[PDB]
Amino acid sequence: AIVKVFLALAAKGPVLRNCISTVVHQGLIRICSKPVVWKVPTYKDYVDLFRHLLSSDQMMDSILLNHLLYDEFVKSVLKIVEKLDLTLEIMIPTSDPAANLHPAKPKDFSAFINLVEFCREILPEKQAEFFEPWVYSFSYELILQSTRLPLISGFYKLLSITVRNAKKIKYFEGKYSCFALFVKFGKEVAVKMKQYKDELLASCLTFLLSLPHNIIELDVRAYVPALQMAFKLGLSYTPLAEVGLNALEEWSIYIDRHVMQPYYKDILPCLDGYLKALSRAAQKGFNKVVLKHLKKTKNLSSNEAISLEEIRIRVVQMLGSLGGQINKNLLTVTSSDEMMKSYVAWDREKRLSFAVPFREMKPVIFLDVFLPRVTELALTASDRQTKVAACELLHSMVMFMLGKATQPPMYQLYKRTFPVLLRLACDVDQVTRQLYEPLVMQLIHWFTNNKKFESQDTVALLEAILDGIVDPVDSTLRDFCGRCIREFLKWSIKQITPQQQEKSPVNTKSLFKRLYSLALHPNAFKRLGASLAFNNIYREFREEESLVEQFVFEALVIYMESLALAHADEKSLGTIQQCCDAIDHLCRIIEKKHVSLNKAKKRRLPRGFPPSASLCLLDLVKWLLAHCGRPQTECRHKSIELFYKFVPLLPGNRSPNLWLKDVLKEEGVSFLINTFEGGGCGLLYLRGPFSLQATLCWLDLLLAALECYNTFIGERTVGALQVLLKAVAFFLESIAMSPQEGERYNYSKCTVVVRIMEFTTTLLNTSPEGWKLLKKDLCNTHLMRVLVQTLCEPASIGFNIGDVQVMAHLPDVCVNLMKALKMSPYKDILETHLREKITAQSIEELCAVNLYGPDAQVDRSRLAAVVSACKQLHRAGLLHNILPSQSTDLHHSVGTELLSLVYKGIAPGSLDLSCKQLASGLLELAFAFGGLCERLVSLLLNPAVLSTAHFSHGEYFYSLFSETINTELLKNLDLAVLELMQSSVDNTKMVSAVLNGMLDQSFRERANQKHQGLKLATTILQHWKKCDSWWAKDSPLETKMAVLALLAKILQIDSSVSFNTSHGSFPEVFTTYISLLADTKLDLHLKGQAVTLLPFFTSLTGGSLEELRRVLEQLIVAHFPMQSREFPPGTPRFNNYVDCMKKFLDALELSQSPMLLELMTEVLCREQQHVMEELFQSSFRRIARRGSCVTQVGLLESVYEMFRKDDPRLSFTRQSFVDRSLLTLLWHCSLDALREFFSTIVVDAIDVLKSRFTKLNESTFDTQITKKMGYYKILDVMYSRLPKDDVHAKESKINQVFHGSCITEGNELTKTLIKLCYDAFTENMAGENQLLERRRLYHCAAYNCAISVICCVFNELKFYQGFLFSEKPEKNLLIFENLIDLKRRYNFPVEVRKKKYIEIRKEAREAANELEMDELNRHECMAPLTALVKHMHRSLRDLPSWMKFLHGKLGNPIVPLNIRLFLAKLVINTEEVFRPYAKHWLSPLLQLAASENNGGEGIHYMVVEIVATILSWTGLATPTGVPKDEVLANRLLNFLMKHVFHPKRAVFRHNLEIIKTLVECWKDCLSIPYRLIFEKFSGKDPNSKDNSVGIQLLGIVMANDLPPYDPQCGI
Structure with missing residues (x-):
């Protein structure tokens, strides 16, 4: 159905074809918002749908695209990452995400770590040509965010996915830009990834080793520490131990066998760890049901869990087919590298005698021989149960060997014991860190003590701590040895007196000399450790005196020197900000005493001084004032800023505006230029690009000599006419150009240009009087040629593609250089230079008609050049002295030509994001000249037809570029309103949509702008006096919905301000809202959106407001049918009814x-x-x-x-x-x-x-x-x-x-x-x-x-x-x-638990052998009387009115039934008063049950609860003793035995439990009825269980006691 509706709404006009674009972008954020770890679906279940709908329609087009869905999904997955802001925020750390695991937005991080794994599981296949045009933008975006946000795992994951797909298609036979940037980021990660831990490390490793490298076969030597780390961090977390070996297969065929063959003594000999209810259904035959349970778990096996046996088998297969010349490196390096460092005696002679006492003989065994197995088993187990046992064994062994040694010294053995205790006390575990942390406090305490002071184990402990502080890869250990060294420093000075402690080699200054020799040691970790010690001890030793002024702030200069000695190792590694913290914690203690105690005594001499005798501040200020010209990079700033902070601390209390002039008028400019120049005041081989190691040193000399001038001149501290050069002319001959080392020359070569740009910038902007003193050779054809080479094609002056810092650094500096020339006499110099290179006929001719199509770089160079040129020209602060280009008043033609060019550019006669961003940059170019909003708004109202084999010709032009247009509209006020309202009745939909495009961008920039909302409101309301006439006959449905929605928006953009004192259009806006919701014009289910917008006007007086209430209640009484609901659910009456009621x-x-x-x-x-x-x-x-x-x-x-x-x-x-x-x-x-x-x-x-x-x-x-x-x-x-x-x-x-x-x-x-x-x-x-x-x-x-x-x-x-x-x-x-x-009357039905009954039978056996308003609880006197009776219980025979009055009125068999039920329902809820009075309250509760005036066919729920409550208080007045209760209880038992059947299942069990608990309580008023059980099991007619009740009752009455004697009362 989903594919059918998608394939239905895609065969029509392209307005509805963007619904399919926004629906997948909605669906991704829909499914990608769950918490990710009945049931909650996490994200897994949707991968089947997202695999089906893509391209399976060619086998799903039976009765009833793919690239559209693919492009939509990739747009929706890289559009979310545009707008997330994953910036993460927040005992001294050294590992980088140590304590900074505080994300700002946890519900976007958990909306991201889901997103990456969803993208991984949807896209590793089906890409046959679709993922090809989506690789550069994805990779550049991810490099940009991952450089902006380094340590976030997952950008590496998506990068690995796209580089897998870019391996699977070819793409890499060397489009050049991605190949150029991957190499730079590859070296970047491969140096960066050292100081990280587990999951981020696995991320970077599976990124690095997945690089293609059969075409990137250059430079294999910086990948081998990233390939031998996968196999060694493998063996426990498997898939990266798989991917390293798949990469090692990938290299060894395509890579040549001559760059590779030395690199086998480091790959192969680390590969040496990898050589080490169905039957429940089937018991009863197999007839279709074992078939059922077999097919219902036949499926569900899709995991590729690579177990270790396939690892070992592919290891042996690859090792076999590798070679014969080359395999045999596998183990010659070991057996002598690391094997015999374990294979040695720990102490040669054997110690630790131990007598284990048997019954009568007591032999002696030596606790040495297993210690190199107990120790290794403590550090690692690959096991859970042996780990805690080995840790406990080693802890008890340590306690034994400690206790032995004070009765046989052991210091050959502590040196290999004590490096295990730290690595166990700070590893990863919970329980063994509950242990071993107090152990390593206790042992530090006993060893930092005079009982074993100046001893040969204390130096072993201290050297083990210091070797713990300084090592490679162990980043979670140095920050624990910090607390060890602080406890060391505290206890060594807590108790030891200064009458002793003048010689000792474990003492304080020995640790300090240790620290300074560590500091000047050129190993970067070896001084990182010393700055870590200082991070951990500056919270001490400033909280005590007499150790401060001697040598540690003398060695403040050695900490400065350590910063200097850390000149150019690695900026990413984290030494520079460490030592900068170490001296940030030092300035704030020199400044809090040496304002006050500026004294002169012999203090300890620092390194780099002549041997004086007074060490106040002044010598250090002269150190910084003749040693400001230290030419190294990142210590110069600390020296300069310490000079500037130290000048308002002299006893003269001076300032750099006067003191520098005071010392310059006496010492000569030579004294303030030999410091600025040093020992380095002072070849046509620079035409080829090269990195001669002297020339970099002179380049550094040049940079230091120029940035020393910058602060003293560009800040008003000296007079520049006192000081105010050929080296810049020495350099400016061959500035425009060792295979990789040439780029190291390129970095330092592109360093000097931005510095001299800002240098000439400030030396213009502060010097009008010394303007002319610049020599005019800077106005030659070199600076104003590298200007155009900076703005155009900068890879041939030094600025590469592949460093995203300097390319964003450049519009800060070049545009400010061009802004620092508008107010200069040499302005026309720059004009007459530049007008041939920023000219307008270049703009006119390079916007040629060939723009769109398969041109990939040939258009792109020129178009990026001209858009960069014109935009930075607009930013340049001076443009109408370059291109006036028109003289009427102010205009330009080719901008409007570009408007028509872009509008014609999409006419049918393609869509890709590169040329789309070209089109967006061009239509943005078309706005910077002049107004032009009138021509665009007139173009938008074109009824033309852009004929497609045709819709509307221009609305798609607006929906393409939708931000630049209205952010231009929002710039100009006081005429945009008139120029929009003039197009009123002819262009209703478009003037509404463009007022929307004004407003919903006006409301968005609020906390930053805070002007456009209220000003847009107070300007748009005064033109609402004219555009009222919309709603009448002939569709007030349309052309009024936009009016009311526009009203809601222009009222929500501000406070409700145009409705008081008729200040705005309050008569007009009031009669608009009254004319809207005074007429019942629309249907039923549509006035809710109009009636939601009530609470704005509702602050006036009466009259008009009660008229609004009158017409509201008028339409209300018009609406509802007669009196009540009459709307059952399922209809568009009940649901929309309660929707508008809910809106009310x-x-x-x-x-x-x-x-x-x-x-x-x-x-x-x-x-x-x-x-x-x-x-x-x-x-x-x-x-x-x-x-x-x-x-x-x-x-x-x-x-x-x-x-x-x-x-x-x-x-x-x-x-x-x-x-x-x-x-x-x-x-x-x-x-x-x-x-x-x-x-x-x-x-x-x-x-x-x-x-x-x-x-x-x-x-x-x-x-x-x-x-x-x-x-x-x-x-x-x-x-x-x-x-x-x-x-x-x-x-x-x-x-x-x-x-x-x-x-x-x-x-x-x-x-x-x-x-x-x-x-x-x-x-x-x-x-x-x-x-x-x-x-x-x-x-x-x-x-x-x-x-x-x-x-x-x-x-x-x-x-x-x-x-x-x-x-x-x-x-x-x-x-x-x-x-x-x-x-x-009172109903009380029959019933319609077991745990309650088994508990009540248990307590009855051990004894003997909120509310719910159902029927009576709504007597509306219940709950206050329950509260009152509970108060009379917990406030202070019988009690007169609340106990004995009921005692008189409930023991009387003439009273009505309902008062008896009321007082009984009272006393069951309130039994707690009648817990110590129940020996009197024993009869009437049962009298109501046994007397046959109960109700229905007995008050059966009152029956079960009244027997339950009378035998809840067993052990206190069992029914015996009372004669009337005897026959009434026998009546109860006989009655319940009569009515016991009740055909439902569990209620019969309920009945029997009632009977057995009842008789088990009683057992003394014996009186068990007979002839009724005889009547039960006297049933003939052998076809139904009429005696089942009789026999199960017989089992009940026999199973206790008291046999069934028949001939005494029966027959």
Whole structure:
């Protein structure tokens, strides 16, 4: 069906053919949003559909494309990755994603790691020519994001997929640009991937080894550490151990056998680890059912889990067919490299005697011989159970060997023990890191101690820590040895006194000299370790004195020197920012003392000084001031910025604007140029590109000498006429050009040009007085030729394709160079140079008619050149001194020609993204000159036919380029509105769509622009005074839907501001909305979209707004049929009815309107119970809180006065407000501090609650009844949630209600409410027949009111003997005979668990041997009395009124049945009071069961629960002892034995459990009935089980005890 509808809507005009484009882009984001780890489908299940719909239609076109679906899917998968922003954010780290596993958006990361695996499983096949034009853009995009975001696994995964497909098709026989960029990124990853871990590492490895390399066979030497890492990180995670070997097969045929043959002693000898219910159905024959269970698991095997045996077999096959000359390298390198480093005695002599005590002999065995197996088994297990055992064994071994040595030294053995404890304490595991971390704290503590100080194991521990800090690949270990070295440093100074500790070789300064010799050591890890130690110890030793000023900030210069010595190793590896942190933590401690203690004593001498005696700041400032000219790259900046920060710290408290001039006027410019030049003040071989190692050193010399001038001149610190060169002319002869090393010359050669560009930029922009002092040879034909070579074809001046940093660096610098020449005397120099190269006739002739088609580079060079030229010319800050090109006022012709060129360019007589972006760049070129919006908007309204073998000629032109057009439209104001509204009635659909194209881009740029929304609104509204006339006869359906939608958008773009004081078009916009929703013009199911837009206007006064309410309720009463729903589901009446009703409800839920509540309540209080009545409850919870409580009391006032009015309504409608609309708003949380609706409410209806009952006519009677009953319910809800420290105390309720302030304490008016509600529910009605059908509700609500007010009594004593109980029945004030109904009947059906019954039988054996309103629980006195009885339980024989009054009234067999059911239903819910009183409460519960006045055919549910509740409290008054209960219990047993059959399955088991639990409880009032069981199993007629009940009952009555004796009572 899916392929049929897709193939149906694709054989027609191309407007509906883009529905198929947006539906797959919707479906991808649909299925790719689940959480990915009944059931939730993850993403797996959809691959079958996405495999079917692509091209299987050629075998699915039986009764009833592929490239369209393919291109749509690839567009939808690389369009999501455009807009995701996967930037990840956030004890010193060294590994790069160590603690930075904090993504910003987890619901896009989990929308991405799903996306990549879905793309992998859909696209490794069926690509036979389809994936070919989709490779460069995909790879360039992914290199761009992965360079912008390095360590995100998955970009490598999609890159591997596309390079697999680019291997499978040919594509690589060397279109040149992708081949040029892959090599650069290959070396980039192959140096970068060192400091990573598991999954990212596997990602980079399966990327690297999947490169084709039979045509990229150059430079194999930087892939071999990435091929021998797969086989060694293999063996546990299998598929990359597979892909390395598939690559090793891939190389060894096509690669020549002469670049390869030395590279076998490193590939092959690491390949040396790889040589080491069906029968349940079938037991009962095989007849079609084993066939069923066989075919239902015949399928479901699709996994290619490469198990290790196929690995070993392909290893041996490849090793055999590899060669004979070459195999035998496989093991000569080992057996002496790494084998005998394990094959040696650990200590030559053997230690560790151990006596294991047997019963009587005690031999001695030596714990050495297994230690090189316990140790290896602890570090790795490839096992789960042996791991924890070996770790525990090694921990106990370590404790033993520690305890032995203080009674036989062991220091030949600690050196190979102690490097295992760290690697175990910080590896990966949970439980062995719960261990071994306190072990390595304990051992560090005991060894950093004077009991074993200056000892030969302490140096083993320290050297093992330092070798732990400095190594290759172990990035999760150095940051643990940091905490070891901090504990080392703390304990070594906590206890040791300075009377000793003047000699020791484990001491503090020995560690410091260790650190400095590590620092100047040229191994990069060897000084990375020292900066890591400093990261971990600068939080110490500044928190103590007397060690600071001596040598560590002398060695601040050696940390600077370590930075300098880290000059040009590798920028990605992470040393430079490490040491920059190490000195960032040093400036903030030199600056917090040496502002104050600028002293002069002998401090320890740093490296690179003459041996002085005072070491204040001034010598270091002179160090930096004669050593600013250090020509290395990334230490110069730290030296300069430390100079600038250190000059406002001298005792003179100086500044660089004066101090540099002060030292320059005395020392000569030679002193401030020999520092700037150094020892390096001062060949036609540069014509060939080469990297002579001297010339790079002079290039570095040139860069340092030019950037030293930059700060002192371009910042106002010196005077440039004091200082103010031939080396730049020495270099500027052959600037425009060792196979790979030439590019290393290219980088440093392209370094100098951008620096001198910005240098001449600042030296113009700060020097008007020294303007002329520039020598004019810079205005020659070289700078203004490399300008055009920069903007055009820059791969022949140095700027490659393959470094995306400098190509985005260039518009910052070239465009600012051209902006720093507009205000110069040598401006016309640049003009008259450039006008022959940025000319307009080049633009005129290179936009030739041959543009579209199979031209792949020949058009592209010229078109990219001219678009780059013109766009950077526009950015250049100076254009109308280059190309005026017209003189009327201002115009240009070829831009409009390009508009017509692009419009003609798609006329039939192709679509690909390269030429499409060409077309977009050209149509963007066509806008920068002048206005031109009028010609485009006039072109768009063309009724021409672009004849296709034809639709509309220009709407597709708008839908092609859809952002550039309206982002041009949004630039200019105050005339775009008029030029759009002039095209009004002839172009209705297009002027609507282009106002949409204005607005929904205006709303999007909001937090950045914040002008265009409100300005577009306040400008578009004043032209709405003219374009009103749309809706009339002849289709107000169309040409009004756009009007109302446009209204909604122009009102949502701003606040509701054009509806007050008639400021905007409020008369106009008001009469538009009134003329819209005043007429019932459309059908039923279409005015919902119009009526959703209510809450904007609803803040005016009365008159017009109540006219809107009047026409709303007018169309409402026009709509609904008579009185209620009448709409069953399945129809477009019920569902759309409740949809527009739900729209009303959510508008009410988002509006704080004191009117629309009064609208919706009457339609609510017209049906008996609404369908979305619960949606009323949740929406009233929502509207119950709004803030600024003057509006809540307004809502309550509105409904209070809509109820208190005197219009003749029904009793039900007068009741239903005060039932379920205002009670609900009083219910959830109105406000706890809201007391206004109790203070200002009482005095007008409490008097009608103290009124007369004028029994004259029922029409004025029943409405008065409903009013009084509602006043009762209001008092109930206002005494329910109201505390008692203001209404039964001295506050503003009695102060409000009595008359002002009086002497009344508070407990007088609660009493006159109590006496009136107790005058209620005491009214007998013995002689009447009038309307008591509501008076029962009256009495019961008054009973609840009495409960509510005794709850606000604080319950210090028992007044319940007068209130709610104990009437005077001699005067017939009978409580129960009216408020209990006694006139309706009670159904109680038969039944229609087992765990409850087995639990109750278990507890009965061990003893002897929320609610649910069903039928009686809605007696509407139930739940408050349950709460009250529970309060009388947990507040403080028999108890008089709440226990003994019922004891008197329930043990009397004359009382009605329904009071007995009420009190029994009470006591089963409230048995907890009658748990310590049940020895009296034992008879009547069973009397109701045994007496035959029960109901139906017995109260069978009351029967089962009353027996369940009387034998729940077994162990306390079993039925024995009472004589009447004896015969009544035997009556119970005989009765239940009579009625026991009930043909349903489990309920018979239920019945038997009742009987057996009952007799098992009893067993003492023996009295078991006979002759009935005889009547059961005396059944003849052998065809049905009439005695099955008899025999199973006989098994019950025998299986306990007490045999079936017949001839005593039977026969």
